[PDB]
Amino acid sequence: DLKLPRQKVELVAPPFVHAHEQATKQGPKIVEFKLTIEEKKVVIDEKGTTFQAMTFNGSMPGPLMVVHEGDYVETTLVNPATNTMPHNIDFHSATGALGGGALTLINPGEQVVLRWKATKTGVFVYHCAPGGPMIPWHVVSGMNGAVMVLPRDGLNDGKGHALKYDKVYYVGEQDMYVPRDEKGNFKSYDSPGEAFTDTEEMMKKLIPSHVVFNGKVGALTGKNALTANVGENVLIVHSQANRDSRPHLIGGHGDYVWETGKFGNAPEVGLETWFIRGGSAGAAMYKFMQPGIYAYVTHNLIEAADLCATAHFKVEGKWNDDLMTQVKAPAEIP
Amino acid sequence: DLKLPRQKVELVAPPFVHAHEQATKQGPKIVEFKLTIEEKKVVIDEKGTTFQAMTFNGSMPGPLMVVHEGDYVETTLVNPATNTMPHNIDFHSATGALGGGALTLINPGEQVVLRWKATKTGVFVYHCAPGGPMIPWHVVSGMNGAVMVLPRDGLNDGKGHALKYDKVYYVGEQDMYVPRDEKGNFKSYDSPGEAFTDTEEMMKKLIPSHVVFNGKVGALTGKNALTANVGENVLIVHSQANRDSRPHLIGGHGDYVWETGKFGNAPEVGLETWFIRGGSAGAAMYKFMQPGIYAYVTHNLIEAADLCATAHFKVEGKWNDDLMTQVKAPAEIP
Amino acid sequence: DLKLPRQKVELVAPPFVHAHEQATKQGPKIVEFKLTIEEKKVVIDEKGTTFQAMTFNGSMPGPLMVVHEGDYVETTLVNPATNTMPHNIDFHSATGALGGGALTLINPGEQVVLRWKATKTGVFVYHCAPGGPMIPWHVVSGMNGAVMVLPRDGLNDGKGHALKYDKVYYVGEQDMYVPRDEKGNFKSYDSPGEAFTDTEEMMKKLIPSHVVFNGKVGALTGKNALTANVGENVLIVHSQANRDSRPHLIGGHGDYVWETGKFGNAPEVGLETWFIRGGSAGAAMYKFMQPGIYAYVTHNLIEAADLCATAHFKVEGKWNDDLMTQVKAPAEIP
Ligand SMILES: OC[C@H]1O[C@@](CO)(O[C@H]2O[C@H](CO)[C@@H](O)[C@H](O)[C@H]2O)[C@@H](O)[C@@H]1O
Ligand SMILES: OC[C@H]1O[C@@](CO)(O[C@H]2O[C@H](CO)[C@@H](O)[C@H](O)[C@H]2O)[C@@H](O)[C@@H]1O
Ligand SMILES: OC[C@H]1O[C@@](CO)(O[C@H]2O[C@H](CO)[C@@H](O)[C@H](O)[C@H]2O)[C@@H](O)[C@@H]1O
Ligand SMILES: O=N[O-]
Ligand SMILES: O=N[O-]
Ligand SMILES: O=N[O-]
Ligand SMILES: O=N[O-]
Ligand SMILES: O=N[O-]
Ligand SMILES: O=N[O-]
Ligand SMILES: O=N[O-]
Ligand SMILES: O=N[O-]
Ligand SMILES: O=N[O-]
Ligand SMILES: [Cu+2]
Ligand SMILES: [Cu+2]
Ligand SMILES: [Cu+2]
Ligand SMILES: [Cu+2]
Ligand SMILES: [Cu+2]
Ligand SMILES: [Cu+2]
């Protein structure tokens, strides 16, 4: 008996985000999404380390879902028979039934349809949570993503001024726990089930072997660097479903940052580094002022440089010598 | 020569909180509390692991003390002769003498009486701190609690509106360090002194064996689940005296959150997950909208599901299908 | 063609800060600083453990640079031929070229001059970042400091009132990774290069052996305790270039705290413990109310008491019995 218009969304793989309006004149609708779970062995680093991943829609992170406050989000969650485990979905944006987890447990070969009303604005984690010790295991295996619930009037700075982004990227950060054998090489496994005992043992010690963006070391570099132009306002949504992170744009700032990720709160301004609490998403916007390469990292630099947690931006435009200039290039000391 | 009325409080064990007013028409009083230190061997998990605990009033955490801004808090701290170690108390709410620690060092068989003026509003940690390496050891052995200093007009949202809670719970989170023997079983000790060398060695490696609420795995589940009804506004005070935490109510939100815990600051609104800095208390209020079971966790889900850090709420009332509904129950994929 | 007045600054070693104005009637100037890199073996604890340090200006942290919004900061970075490695500098306060890192890479025997416009207010990290895995290694070897960019009208409370400090201290916190040999003693190395392989192995495990202020256990105690008088407002700038911290003044508070460190945001009030995200600086001001000794710690008390992260303040003045009093000294229990 919920008589509103229905709108289908075609999700796109991260770090890109499906097309959407910021401010809208649409009223509430039932926005329809489909997520199909895929368990798969993937490569996570440039050395060829493999990993028993569990994913929504084939990606780590799962895709970003975007709706507006007061929309109803109707998700068909599909667990094909080619998977081995039960799965479900918990939306941190939703109210009741463990975020939906208690209404969405599906065995291989099943699907379920959950609807929730988007009553809270912000960016939020979604993740699998089948019960007990399986909860962390599915999450750290990759079964997490995010959903953005925009105000119908779009974003604002808390001081009456609209904040409109020219583009948005979703960076999902994943702590991974890959065991090593006696001589110190990473182990490979034939199935997630086979990976579980060694993986849980390592998980409980709370030190990841890898911390990656978009599912692999280097995922958001080279051909797949993020991009912008001088003058463009870019929103960067960052999530971490299990473990804290401290994002930083090297050579830039967070002009407007919602580190707790919730648009009912005004953004902070002019940050160097912000903090994503494990189990949350946050967002930062920056207007690029200088061309060139930037790195986007977690600012535990050991994690960034040595465990995988670095993305790049390639930015086009004109250099601004007022903001920064090399007065004297490297030369012998007099 | 401090000539104000005296009021005794009968403390109650966590997660419950002694009776108190939110807004009050009372002026300042001298509010009298007694804390009696107990060292004791306790069971911390469902496997029967034992732990050399050190407690205020027999509990982990120590009980929540509640006063109003401008009250004087007069604590009789008692260290019975049946204990083995010196102890003291540091109130993060207090000004001077290391929070009181420098005025309250008592050997077994002694007591001391400290008064401090409640000039800062919020929730605050209190903990033992006898000196040097004993400081962390006593804290991580359980010797910590919290004190709430309310505004005399009660809580507000920073926008002129009163925030009144229907009930309050105190969740004290404890990082514990229980060593293992060569084959990998947790060790048991005959006294705290005997536990110290192995425990310190483990402590310095900064990875707990257990992270619990209310002193044990499962403490706030089953018979001892937290409770609410749909429509009730519940305040959840969360403390962690030594290590960070990231609280999250699964299936709910933080409607109003003071993550740094201090009522001179407006609350943030509509959070998914908040952050308790080690060495602090914070508070979150939520009005329940849906019946059923909720889990309240730290959202490092490894800690929550595998190391002990999960509580439950059981909530009574009517399900709201507008907020959430299972449109199609699990079924075979077409 | 940048035609502004030039002003030289003589930097001073932490925890002290070079002389500067808070509010100023000066307009923009080119403020000139020199940093000379020194690699050196130092002692980091009272047991005589040694450490292959890499420093700006000989200190850990590097010195605090202080300017005003809209100044241009012109740094001559010098890498003497007596050093072994290339080095550079990344200012989190600066815009473009990886914070300056991409314009300042200098081999031993070279210097470079970088200018950047101080368009963002707050306290910010600066650090070396030569590329790749060298980034974390140089940072955790000591190559980090901070720069404070004040509003030209000085600090304010966000409610229209000026906040003027009577003194400022800079506490730089350093996570250090010193490997151990088979029997468990800390290793010593003949050069940073020789320390690298064992040090990187340890770094990737994300547990420091030492967490210190001002470069060594006990650096800011005894003769070198911080000082104040009752009635003095002290600003404490705290930085951590790689790893989170949770500052706390034992026996005091943070009266006004910018935990994310950026003066475009109002301070929070009345904190017990605040949070410095790794890769940032923050600042807290406190007006002392009581004489005596205070400890300033990270409130992971294991880190504070056992790994090195404790400073002291010695405060002169008159005790205030209204704020705190020992009603009854320790005595036998009746
Ligand atoms: O940015 C959110 C922040 O801004 C304030 C105004 O200071 O409210 C603005 O944003 C609200 C949510 O979008 C709007 O409903 C409101 O009309 C607008 O002024 C704060 O109240 C809020 O915390
Ligand atoms: O919620 C605290 C926050 O609210 C403001 C008003 O925006 O002040 C309110 O709360 C103060 C502390 O309880 C009251 O003294 C004040 O009268 C009331 O308006 C902020 O100033 C404060 O940060
Ligand atoms: O403390 C910064 C905070 O204060 C406000 C007023 O609430 O602005 C003050 O500080 C600004 C930066 O120094 C000044 O430009 C402004 O004039 C002054 O009122 C906030 O806007 C700001 O977030
Ligand atoms: O070689 N086994 O881990
Ligand atoms: O500035 N970042 O390493
Ligand atoms: O290249 N030396 O000035
Ligand atoms: O068996 N000793 O730890
Ligand atoms: O939603 N919590 O795992
Ligand atoms: O039960 N299958 O539709
Ligand atoms: O003794 N070698 O580490
Ligand atoms: O109050 N500090 O340990
Ligand atoms: O010293 N005993 O009261
Ligand atoms: Cu799953
Ligand atoms: Cu969750
Ligand atoms: Cu004690
Ligand atoms: Cu403390
Ligand atoms: Cu360097
Ligand atoms: Cu940096």
Indicate whether A145 and A251 sit together in one domain. Answer: no
Domain range for B184:
167-316
C92 is catalytic: yes
Q: What residue's CA is closest to ligand 5, atom 2? A: A250
Give the β-pairing of A310-316 and A226-229.
parallel
Q: Is B257 helix (H, G, I), strand (E, B) or coil?
A: strand
C238 is catalytic: no
> CA dihedral in degrees (B42, B45, B51, B55; nearest 10)?
-60
Q: What residue's CA is closest to ligand 11, atom 2? A: C250
The owner of tokens 């019960």 is A131
**Domain boundary pick from A119, A152, A185:** A152
Cα separation, C193 vs C85, whole angstroms: 9
| Residue in A closest to B158 by C-alpha | A265
Check if B331 contacts A (Cβ < 8 Å): yes
B143 is catalytic: yes
Give me the amino acid identity at A101.
G
**8 A C-beta contact, residue A126 and residue A93:** yes
Kindly list the residues from chain C whose CB atom is less than 8 angstroms away from the CB atom of residue B278: 246, 273, 299-300
Q: Which residues 184-203 in chain B show a CB within 8 A of chain C?
A: 200, 203
Check if B167 contacts C (Cβ < 8 Å): no
Distance A143 CA to ligand 13 centre (A): 6
Indicate whether C110 and C245 sit together in one domain. Answer: no
Domain count, chain C: 2
- Classify residue C185 as exposed, middle or buried by CB count within 10 Å of its CB (0-12, 13-18, 19+): exposed
Q: Where are the beta strands (DSSP E) in A230-323?
A: 233-240, 247-250, 254-258, 268-271, 280-287, 292-298, 310-316
Give the strand order in the sheet containing C167-176.
C210-213, C167-176, C233-240, C280-287, C254-258, C268-271
Q: Which of C97, C264, C277 sits opposite A273 (nearest CB)?
A: C277
- Show Cβ contacts of residue A213 under 8 Å, excluding neighbours closer than 6 positions: A171, A172, A173, A174, A219, A220, A308, A309, A310, A311
Q: Which residues 99-118 in chain C show a CB within 8 A of chain A?
A: 99-107, 109-117
The backbone torsions φ and ψ at residue B302, rounded to the nearest 5 degrees and listed phi first, read -65, -45
Cα separation, B197 vs B122, whole angstroms: 36
The owner of tokens 């416009």 is C117
Check if B28 contacts C (Cβ < 8 Å): no
Q: For residue A55, what is the domain's CATH number?
A: 2.60.40.420
Distance C196 CA to ligand 10 centre (A): 14
Indicate whether C138 and C33 sit together in one domain. Answer: yes
**Residue environment code for C217-248, b if the CB has 16+ CB neighbours within 10 A, otherwise e:** bbbbbeeebbebebebbbbbbbbbbbbbbbbb
Q: What is the DSSP secondary structure assignment for residue C272, as one 8-state letter?
A: S
Kindly list the residues from chain A whose CB atom is less than 8 angstroms away from the CB atom of residue B325: 114-115
Kindly list the residues from chain A whose CB atom is less than 8 angstroms away from the CB atom of residue B271: 260, 262
Report whether residue C333 contacts ligand 12, using a CB cutoff of 6 Å. Answer: no
Method: X-ray
Indicate whether C176 and C147 sit together in one domain. Answer: no
Cα separation, C261 vs C64, whole angstroms: 14
Indicate whether B134 and B82 sit together in one domain. Answer: yes
- Show Cβ contacts of residue C321 under 8 Å, excluding neighbours closer than 6 positions: none
Candidates A268, A275, A214, A279; CA nearest to A242 is: A279
**8 A C-beta contact, residue C41 and residue C53:** yes
Residue A145 domain flag: yes
Query: Is B90 among the annotated ligand-binding positions?
Result: yes
Cα separation, A155 vs A164, whole angstroms: 7
C248 is catalytic: yes
According to DSSP, the residues that pair with B148 across neighbouring strands are B66, B123
**Domain boundary pick from C92, C119, C151:** C151
Residue B228 domain flag: yes
Residue C326 domain flag: no
Kindly list the residues from chain A whose CB atom is less than 8 angstroms away from the CB atom of residue C105: 330
**Residue environment code for B218-247, b if the CB has 16+ CB neighbours within 10 A, otherwise e:** bbbbeeebbebebebbbbbbbbbbbbbbbb
Residue C328 domain flag: no
Cα separation, B18 vs B145, whole angstroms: 14
Distance B76 CA to ligand 17 centre (A): 54
CA distance B85 to chain C (A): 15
Indicate whether B218 and B127 sit together in one domain. Answer: no
Show the tokens assigned to B242: 């030594």
Binding residues of A for Cu(2+): 87, 90, 92, 127-128, 138, 143, 299
Candidates B178, B172, B308, B303; CA nearest to B240 is: B172
Residue B35 domain flag: yes
Report whether residue A329 contacts ligand 6, using a CB cutoff of 6 Å. Answer: no
C303 is catalytic: no
A38 phi-psi bin (left φ>0, alpha ψ -120 to 50, beta other) = beta
Resolution expressed in Å: 1.2
Q: Is B303 helix (H, G, I), strand (E, B) or coil?
A: helix
Report whether residue A127 contacts ligand 5, using a CB cutoff of 6 Å. Answer: no
Q: What residue's CA is closest to ligand 8, atom 2? A: B250
Indicate whether B126 and B198 sit together in one domain. Answer: no
Report whether residue C329 contacts ligand 12, using a CB cutoff of 6 Å. Answer: no
Give the β-pairing of B6-8 and B30-43.
parallel
Check if B256 contacts A (Cβ < 8 Å): no
Indicate whether B11 and B107 sit together in one domain. Answer: yes
Pocket test for ligand 1, best of A121, A156, A161, A164 (most atoms within 8 A of CB): A156
Check if B274 contacts A (Cβ < 8 Å): yes
| Residue in B closest to A125 by C-alpha | B272
B273 is catalytic: yes
Check if B205 contacts A (Cβ < 8 Å): no
**8 A C-beta contact, residue A142 and residue B275:** no
Show the tokens assigned to C287: 């007006």
Indicate whether A148 and A176 sit together in one domain. Answer: no
- CA A156 from chain centre, in angstroms, equals 22
**8 A C-beta contact, residue B119 and residue B129:** no
**Domain boundary pick from A125, A152, A179:** A152
Angle at A143 between CA A137 and CA A148, to 5 degrees: 135
**8 A C-beta contact, residue B190 and residue B39:** no
Cα separation, C221 vs C229, whole angstroms: 17
Indicate whether C130 and C31 sit together in one domain. Answer: yes
Q: Is C103 helix (H, G, I), strand (E, B) or coil?
A: helix
Cα separation, A275 vs B275, whole angstroms: 10
Check if A255 contacts C (Cβ < 8 Å): no
Indicate whether C13 and C121 sit together in one domain. Answer: yes
C210 is catalytic: no
B272 is catalytic: yes
Query: Is B92 among the annotated ligand-binding positions?
Result: yes
> Of the bound ligands, which one is closest to the alpha carbon of residue C334?
12
- DSSP letters of B122-187? EEEEEE---STTHHHHHHHTT-EEEEEEE-TB-EE-SSS-EE--SEEEEEEEEEE---B-TTSPBP
Give the β-pairing of C90-91 and C122-127.
antiparallel
Residue B301 domain flag: yes
Cβ–Cβ of C262/A250 closer than 8 Å? no
C65 is catalytic: no
Atom of ligand 11 nearest to the CA of C251: 1
According to DSSP, the residues that pair with A144 across neighbouring strands are A127
Indicate whether C96 and C124 sit together in one domain. Answer: yes
Cβ–Cβ of A246/C205 closer than 8 Å? no
Residue A79 domain flag: yes
Query: Is C138 among the annotated ligand-binding positions?
Result: yes
Query: Is B264 among the annotated ligand-binding positions?
Result: yes
Q: What residue's CA is closest to ligand 7, atom 1? A: B181
| Residue C216 Cα distances to A84, B165, B217, C63, angstroms | 53, 47, 39, 16
Cα separation, B91 vs B77, whole angstroms: 12
Cα separation, B79 vs B75, whole angstroms: 13
Q: Tell me which of B45, B54, B71, B87 is the catalytic residue.
A: B87
Residue B96 domain flag: yes
Which of A74, A79, A92 would best serve as a mutation to test chain B binding (most B beta carbons within 10 A)?
Answer: A92
Atom of ligand 2 nearest to the CA of B155: 13
End-to-end CA distance of chain B: 82
Cα separation, A65 vs C254, whole angstroms: 40
Cβ–Cβ of B139/C301 closer than 8 Å? yes
- DSSP letters of A110-153? EEEEEEEE--S-EEEEEE---STTHHHHHHHTT-EEEEEEE-TB
**Which residues of A carry out catalysis?**
87, 90, 92, 127-128, 138, 143, 248, 272-273, 299
